[PDB]
Amino acid sequence: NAQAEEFKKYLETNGIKPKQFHKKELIFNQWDPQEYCIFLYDGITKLTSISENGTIMNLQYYKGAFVIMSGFIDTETSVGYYNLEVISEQATAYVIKINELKELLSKNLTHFFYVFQTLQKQVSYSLAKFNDFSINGKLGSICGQLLILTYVYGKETPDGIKITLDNLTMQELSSAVSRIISKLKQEKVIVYKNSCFYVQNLDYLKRYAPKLDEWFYLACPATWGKLN
Amino acid sequence: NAQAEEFKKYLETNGIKPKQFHKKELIFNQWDPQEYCIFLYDGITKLTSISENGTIMNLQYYKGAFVIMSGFIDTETSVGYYNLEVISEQATAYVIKINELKELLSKNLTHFFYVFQTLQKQVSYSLAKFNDFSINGKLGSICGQLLILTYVYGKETPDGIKITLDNLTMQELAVSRIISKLKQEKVIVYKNSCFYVQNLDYLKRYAPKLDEWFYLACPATWGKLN
Numbered sequence: 194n195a196q197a198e199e200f201k202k203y204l205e206t207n208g209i210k211p212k213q214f215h216k217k218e219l220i221f222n223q224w225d226p227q228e229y230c231i232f233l234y235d236g237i238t239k240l241t242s243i244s245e246n247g248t249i250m251n252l253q254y255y256k257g258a259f260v261i262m263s264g265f266i267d268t269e270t271s272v273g274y275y276n277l278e279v280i281s282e283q284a285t286a287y288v289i290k291i292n293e294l295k296e297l298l299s300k301n302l303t304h305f306f307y308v309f310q311t312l313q314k315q316v317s318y319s320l321a322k323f324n325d326f327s328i329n330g331k332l333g334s335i336c337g338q339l340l341i342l343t344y345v346y347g348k349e350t351p352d353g354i355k356i357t358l359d360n361l362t363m364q365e366l367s368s369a370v371s372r373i374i375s376k377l378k379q380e381k382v383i384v385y386k387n388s389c390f391y392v393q394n395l396d397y398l399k400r401y402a403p404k405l406d407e408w409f410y411l412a413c414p415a416t417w418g419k420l421n
Numbered sequence: 422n423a424q425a426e427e428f429k430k431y432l433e434t435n436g437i438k439p440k441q442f443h444k445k446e447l448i449f450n451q452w453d454p455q456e457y458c459i460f461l462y463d464g465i466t467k468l469t470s471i472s473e474n475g476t477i478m479n480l481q482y483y484k485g486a487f488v489i490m491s492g493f494i495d496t497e498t499s500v501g502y503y504n505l506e507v508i509s510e511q512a513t514a515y516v517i518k519i520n521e522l523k524e525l526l527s528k529n530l531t532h533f534f535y536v537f538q539t540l541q542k543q544v545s546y547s548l549a550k551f552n553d554f555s556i557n558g559k560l561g562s563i564c565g566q567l568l569i570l571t572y573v574y575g576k577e578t579p580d581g582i583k584i585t586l587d588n589l590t591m592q593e594l595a596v597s598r599i600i601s602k603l604k605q606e607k608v609i610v611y612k613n614s615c616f617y618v619q620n621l622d623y624l625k626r627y628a629p630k631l632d633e634w635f636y637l638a639c640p641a642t643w644g645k646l647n
């Protein structure tokens with residue numbers, strides 16, 4: 194990725210170095226009074242929150258390159274009691290205090306625009322997810338998630354669109370969800386063949402995740418067209 | 422709101438004047454190739470999506486002051502085929518072509534942050550709403566909507582906290598079943614054209630993460646009833 198590589202060299206040009214994290218580690222946590230801007234450069238993370246009793250609810254998944262803020266740019270206070278957990282075996286991230294990010298995005302605009310449009314992609318993503326859910330319930334939500342996994346890690350092969358993602362991460366990606374996923378398998382929308390998973394009915398996923406499909410077309414058109 | 426007013430002048434000083442809309446008008450629409458940055462200064466709007474067949478999906482409700490953008494600030498292309506419909510009787514919005522916003526946001530860090538910050542409020546709003554719904558179904562959802570409505574339009578009366586909003590405006594905000602259940606549980610009561618919330622702690626208990634979001638995003642108004 195190009196627009197994200199420039200942001201990386203903008204951070205390093207100002208002295209910020211990368212840190213390596215590993216599975217189950219938290220890049221930021223819900224109890225820290227200091228808030229940060231996380232430029233996730235490589236790896237897969239998930240935003241999590243603990244309810245009143247102790248149930249860990251998964252809120253959102255991110256893969257580098259991306260920008261996750263734990264605090265408001267202006268107030269520097271928390272946007273929510275959230276933790277950013279690594280779910281890939283390793284992850285590389287730049288950790289900037291919200292204190293200092295505001296000053297760095299002022300000295301430049303191409304890189305403010307970069308962080309600014311990631312927020313926009315998040316905003317529209319959630320609205321599209323909400324729209325698909327309101328129409329097809331969780332089926333649309335699960336088709337949508339599999340749709341973006343297909344567009345991101347998918348590559349066409351004779352057996353269909355092969356999801357080129359180690360299963361140790363895909364299994365990370367409860368009962369209501371497991372039933373839907375394997376009903377798609379029973380319907381041969383997605384199939385297992387020789388240690389790999391292939392999407393064999395792409396149009397099915399598009400049918401029940403239309404607004405997430407449109408979101409990806411609008412947000413990542415070049416990657417959308419590969420499989421369209 | 423302090424920061425909303427400082428942004429208002431910045432647009433006026435630079436030569437963008439407010440435009441008045443009335444109920445049912447679309448400040449922007451999903452078939453328009455020109456994308457805009459809308460600072461809705463006053464009034465209540467709703468973000469919709471219209472499919473080929475014509476159903477109007479209601480995606481989000483905004484109240485001024487807020488900022489809604491229909492295009493990406495860098496590519497200027499659509500972020501989604503949406504409309505911003507006015508649901509109150511009147512509304513006042515500053516309509517800026519997205520190309521022109523880049524100039525204004527380029528020359529100020531304070532006003533850039535204001536819009537940046539409101540996008541963050543939206544991201545965390547959606548996660549909180551998602552968290553509440555995955556733990557308490559639609560009950561927590563409507564409790565959340567009623568909660569923030571009570572927070573913004575709350576006015577104490579002898580018969581509970583009055584939701585000081587127009588009946589036609591709240592008419593525009595399954596669901597009915599939940600509302601009836603709420604009525605039969607000593608929570609919400611309807612009479613004389615408005616709703617009254619008598620047990621506000623009930624709503625906080627089933628909309629905890631959106632109560633947290635309101636606590637974290639809108640403290641001054643959160644402290645009204647806390």
Ligand code: NA
Nearest residue numbers: 222223225263
């Ligand atoms: Na934190």
Ligand code: NA
Nearest residue numbers: 450451453491
């Ligand atoms: Na439009």
